[PDB]
Amino acid sequence: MLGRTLSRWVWISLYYVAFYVVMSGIFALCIYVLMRTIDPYTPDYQDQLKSPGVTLRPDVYGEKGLDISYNVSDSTTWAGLAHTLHRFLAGYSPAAQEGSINCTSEKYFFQESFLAPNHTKFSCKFTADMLQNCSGRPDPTFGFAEGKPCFIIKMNRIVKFLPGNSTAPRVDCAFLDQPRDGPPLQVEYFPANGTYSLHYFPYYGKKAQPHYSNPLVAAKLLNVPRNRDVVIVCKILAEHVSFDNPHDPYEGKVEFKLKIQK
Amino acid sequence: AMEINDHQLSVAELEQKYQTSATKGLSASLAAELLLRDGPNALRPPRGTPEYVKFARQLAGGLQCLMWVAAAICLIAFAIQASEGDLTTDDNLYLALALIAVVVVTGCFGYYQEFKSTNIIASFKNLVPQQATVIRDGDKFQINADQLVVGDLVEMKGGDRVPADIRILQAQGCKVDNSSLTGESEPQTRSPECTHESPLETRNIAFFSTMCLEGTAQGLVVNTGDRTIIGRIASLASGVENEKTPIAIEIEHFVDIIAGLAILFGATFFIVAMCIGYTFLRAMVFFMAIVVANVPEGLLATVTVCLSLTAKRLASKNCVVKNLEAVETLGSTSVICSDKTGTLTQNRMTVSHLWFDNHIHSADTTEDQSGQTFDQSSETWRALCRVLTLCNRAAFKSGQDAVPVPKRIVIGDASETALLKFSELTLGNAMGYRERFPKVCEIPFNSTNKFQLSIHTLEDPRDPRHVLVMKGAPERVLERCSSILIKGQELPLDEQWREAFQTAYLSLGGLGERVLGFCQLYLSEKDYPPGYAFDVEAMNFPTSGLCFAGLVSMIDPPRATVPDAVLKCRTAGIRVIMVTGDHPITAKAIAASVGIISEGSETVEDIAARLRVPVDQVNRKDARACVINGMQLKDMDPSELVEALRTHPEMVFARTSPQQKLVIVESCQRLGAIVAVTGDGVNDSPALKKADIGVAMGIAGSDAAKNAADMILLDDNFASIVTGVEQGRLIFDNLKKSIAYTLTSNIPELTPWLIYITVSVPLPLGCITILFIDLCTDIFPSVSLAYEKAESDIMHLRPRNPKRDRLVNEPLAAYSYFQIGAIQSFAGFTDYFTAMAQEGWFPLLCVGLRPQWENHHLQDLQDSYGQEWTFGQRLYQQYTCYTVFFISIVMCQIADVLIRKTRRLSAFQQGFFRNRILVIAIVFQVCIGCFLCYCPGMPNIFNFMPIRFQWWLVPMPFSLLIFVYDEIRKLGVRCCPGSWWDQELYY
Ligand SMILES: CCCCCCCC/C=C\CCCCCCCC(=O)OC[C@H](COP(=O)(O)OCC[N+](C)(C)C)OC(=O)CCCCCCC/C=C/CCCCCCCC
Ligand SMILES: CCCCCCCC/C=C\CCCCCCCC(=O)OC[C@H](COP(=O)(O)OCC[N+](C)(C)C)OC(=O)CCCCCCC/C=C\CCCCCCCC
Ligand SMILES: CC(C)CCC[C@@H](C)[C@H]1CC[C@H]2[C@@H]3CC=C4C[C@@H](O)CC[C@]4(C)[C@H]3CC[C@]12C
Ligand SMILES: *[C@@H]1O[C@H](CO)[C@@H](O)[C@H](O)[C@H]1NC(C)=O
Ligand SMILES: *[C@@H]1O[C@H](CO)[C@@H](O)[C@H](O)[C@H]1NC(C)=O
Ligand SMILES: *[C@@H]1O[C@H](CO)[C@@H](O)[C@H](O)[C@H]1NC(C)=O
Ligand SMILES: *[C@@H]1O[C@H](CO)[C@@H](O)[C@H](O)[C@H]1NC(C)=O
Ligand SMILES: *[C@@H]1O[C@H](CO)[C@@H](O)[C@H](O)[C@H]1NC(C)=O
Ligand code: ALF
Ligand SMILES: [K+]
Ligand SMILES: [K+]
Ligand SMILES: [K+]
Ligand SMILES: [Mg+2]
């Protein structure tokens, strides 16, 4: 009976219930209409996806950045890195790649029609062995045992994005600040040149290609001085990949602080 | 504190009391000791309060304290985050700085709102005399007035302000000006013989700071400094309890409401955050966000701006105000206690009536001579006009041809000035008419004669006859006259004529007027040749058996506008009271003329006279009016004062002292009434300070009244009170409209945060953008609602009830928060989800997505299409959500200001473009939205993105729904006034 009698409380409550029910119904109708208009295969816009981001494995983050430190002589220092690399490559084992098909086009894999089972588009097979020497076989340590660690660089997939077909997009990893007496960082890449083959592009979306797997590039570093804190930046050299965004550091390029101990 | 009772004591008792001498005075050593003891003979000005201390209070309050707490949370969060090495939340520091700036700017606006630049206390120094002649050790020597102490034998002469309350011992034709006490400039005799019990009305007590007009008088000093009457008045006026203004009360009330809701929301959802798994620092940031969303940042400032605009409109009519809070009180006022002399009248004796031809003629008394005139085409009238022109010694100041006649300066008696101005107004040049009728004998007003007589040679040289003309008391001329100008002829006197004359005299006296007789005789050239020197002392004139011309009465008349102003104030439901120091008969006459007493209303004595029944048996409930003088009121107890106030709606207090004026004001206030006091004098100043709002006349006003007042009528136009009432009510209605508009957008700023905490969607709105809504896009439209017209007849409405009627009540708050704010929230969230989904983030994926969305270590989060997003790209998408929510609020606020123009009337009926300021504010709001969205650099500056246009168009249906539903609500309120709809959904 605070301000008004009980009957009036019931009436004002019923009015507010009706008001909020009607407004919630209007909101549900708006969202229903919006999802009716939304296209199930291609996003309406890609205003924030103009250039793809780049990530690396194993991802160990330090002080606002990718900090990877291990001591070669102690195995437990790099056991986590090896285990996570294996866990990441289990998804590229050929058992998991069964859904995708083999390709040798070496050119853009344009598809306009749904020829795969239940109205889908083909994806191409990328297996673990294609990494060869960093593929977890026959060395399970990925070279972290011998001081030549194997780093897998992956590109963020964007629908209907073409990275330019003058040549396959390539990885070039180097020291961010080259020491004057230091030799430039030599890295062996797997596949040759560390290139993403053009038949993996374009990506058509999770609905069109439910079994799509991104191509990988394994960068085996060979010129890392021991007991020295070095910073290495990996960039993607594609025509339509730009790495000049100071606000986003992972757009087209990835940097990580590495310290291999002895 | 001592009361004066020395006026009754004799010379011997005074000598024994003050150890003084009636002729020698005080000894110098004793005088110095008494000076050391009692201090000087000067008023002590209260220090007051410092400027900066009052400013410090402004930086406190409900909203102020909430913003201090919110900035404290922000600074603590930033410091803790930085101490761990993270520096990404520089936004927290910027938020802290902006909140502090908001607090300080709000404090400056609040200080400017209540600021008075008047010193007030410094008024009581221009009334204080500087020099004072004092008799010590039997020597008359001059000293400064500050040095006087009680017991000093002071001599004063005409033209010199009295230096203290003085027990007059010797007097030779002394007359004083007791205006600072009674409001009357009528000269009062001073003589040693006591005439009254009360020390105020006696003739043997001069007062500190009263201008001694003429003559010389001697006296002992009984009171010095603040112990004097003027000292008591100054202490009551300068030092009175500070009273909160009604608009300030309303502001503090609605601040309480907002603070309560903010604390409630913040604490409830802090508890929710703690239960559902948030850290203490995170829940603190949430509480900060909820407080910032709930607090109105620009509201108090826009209130000040609206008050400034109302003050500008008022001052455009010469109605200057002294603090912006005063701009509203009159609209809320339900009682107007009003001074009489100078306030309701022009304080100038003028001719009121003329009695001749057996007829009472009313002459026009307005200062601009815009009123009805009397008939001037009678032979008796022409003879009378000549006579009243001729019996006059006063003259104007030469060179005042341009200055109007009533305002023109004269030297003489008050009666003489009135008669001269009346003759100048009736004729061309009274100076000319009196010079062309040369004067040969002049007998001024004498105590023994009891009249004024003069002998004049007729202007026409063909008639060498000499016209005797006389002026005096009606009854005193009746016995000195034998014929009478009746209908233009000389008629002998009969008992019927004496009865008529007596009836006329009694009628004119009972209208509170001084009546003067007029008569004339023509002297033939037979007995009096042209070269007959008319000696005064010889008395060769018959000096009797003359011919009565006609009776004239004078009164201080109301100003021309005042009757209309009082009638309008009474129509607006305002009770009008006259508190005055003038005599009861004059006060009742003026009340009847002005309209304070209606026509037909009568007093207990009026009913008793009509019924020829004694006063005791006259039932009080039948008397609509009541005249109470100072004596009766003084012994009247507070319960009896309240009973009288209830019993009689038309009240006149007469012969009252300034303390009694204050007692009356505080009695009206204790009855839950907002009281205005209108005065112009020093005796009005305590009441002007006690009143909710004090209004002072500009020209006629004195410095004490002007310093105590809150509002001044520069042009002396009393009808500006009506304009002030209208503007106060209008600004109250428009203030609540503007407040409702401002409050509405608080909910669309709060709901994203509650949804963020609860559903863990990515952040829809930011604190910076919330501040942008409050400080930029909300300011102009809300202020522009101060220019709305009145919808109904406000001046016919009755005053609001200060307990019941409020600025922000529960209906206003509920409508704004839980209906319009709810719609605007729904609009914002529709736009948010649309923008998210068009960019690949379907509504189901957003739910629970906050932890992965805000992970710096998750640089390949997938959207609903399988696309992988970095943290930077997700942040820029979040900024797009910010802008889309901000634009939704801006458009819904356009619709909301379109519906806030009226509370009971249709937009189609009142018109959309009547208010140009509103449409310009709408254009401004859209322009700033566009500039913030599309200026280069904004994504990095203020987290505003260039959004696509369909996202502008999305909330327009919700804007339209707001408009339509509000219009339908108003339609229902209009159609069914006695309905549950009107009772619950009107605000
Ligand atoms: C003070 C008390 C306040 C009380 C407020 C109550 C608010 C009630 C409002 C909404 C409740 C739920 C409404 C949901 C209606 C959805 C209608 C619907 O059936 O849609 C279908 C979608 C499924 O799409 P799909 O996967 O097939 O599409 C794939 C695209 N294709 C189809 C082409 C392949 O289902 C979906 O969207 C599911 C996700 C729905 C969106 C979640 C909304 C939650 C957020 C609510 C906040 C709203 C504002 C509250 C402000 C209150 C103001 C005071
Ligand atoms: C006057 C005082 C009144 C008091 C009345 C209280 C009544 C309501 C109180 C409790 C009822 C709800 C109980 C909640 C149970 C626990 C839920 C929980 O433990 O969830 C866990 C998640 C945290 O896991 P994560 O994945 O985020 O961690 C990610 C970690 N990283 C970021 C490092 C990767 O919690 C999160 O932090 C994110 C939130 C997700 C769960 C939300 C659950 C809340 C839903 C509905 C509550 C509705 C209350 C509405 C009240 C209206 C008031 C007008
Ligand atoms: C869950 C059951 C038991 C109760 C449901 C109450 C719900 C519907 C909520 C939603 C909106 C709320 C109302 C919002 C507005 C008002 C007007 C206010 O001046 C009184 C409270 C009142 C009336 C609130 C009471 C509680 C309320 C009616
Ligand atoms: C690396 O590990 C070995 C074995 O645990 C230890 O002896 C050595 O000191 C470590 N390296 C450094 C730089 O400490
Ligand atoms: C979809 O296709 C897969 C193989 O591509 C098949 O195993 C599955 O049964 C299909 N589902 C339907 C509903 O046809
Ligand atoms: C790759 O593996 C082969 C296996 O024989 C080995 O000889 C070669 O050294 C490896 N390459 C590097 C860079 O270690
Ligand atoms: C690159 O793609 C274009 C079509 O986009 C095609 O015409 C061209 O032949 C391609 N270049 C090569 C070298 O295959
Ligand atoms: C890339 O690999 C090819 C082998 O087909 C070789 O000819 C070429 O030199 C390599 N380029 C780089 C930059 O390693
Ligand atoms: F002017 Al007044 F009482 F009428 F002081
Ligand atoms: K706010
Ligand atoms: K006042
Ligand atoms: K607001
Ligand atoms: Mg006065």
Residue numbers in the entry:
A (entry chain B): 29 to 290
B (entry chain A): 47 to 1033
Paper text:
The gastric H+,K+-ATPase mediates electroneutral exchange of 1H+/1K+ per ATP hydrolysed across the membrane. One of the notable differences between HKA and NKA is the presence of Lys791 and its salt bridge partner Glu820 in HKA, which physically restrict K+-binding space at the site I position. In this work, to elucidate the molecular basis of the different K+ stoichiometry in these two pumps, we evaluated a series of NKA-mimetic mutants of HKA with increasing substitutions.
Our step-wise and tailored construction of the mutants finally gave a two-K+ bound H+,K+-ATPase, achieved by five mutations, including amino acids directly coordinating K+ (Lys791Ser, Glu820Asp), indirectly contributing to cation-binding site formation (Tyr340Asn, Glu936Val), and allosterically stabilizing K+-occluded conformation (Tyr799Trp). This quintuple mutant in the K+-occluded E2-P state unambiguously shows two separate densities at the cation-binding site in its 2.6 Å resolution cryo-EM structure. However, this quintuple mutant crystal did not diffract well, and produced only 20 Å reflections. Its EM map now unambiguously showed two spherical densities at the cation-binding site, highly likely representing two K+ ions. Satisfyingly, in the quintuple mutant structure, Asp824 now makes a hydrogen bond with Lys791Ser (3.0 Å), and fixes the Lys791Ser position suitable for K+-coordination (2.7 Å) as seen in the NKA structure. Total valence 35,36 for K+ calculated from the distance between K+ and surrounding oxygen atoms showed acceptable values for K+ coordination at site I (0.65) and site II (0.68). Except for this water molecule, K+-coordination in the HKA quintuple mutant is almost identical to that in the NKA K+-occlusion state.
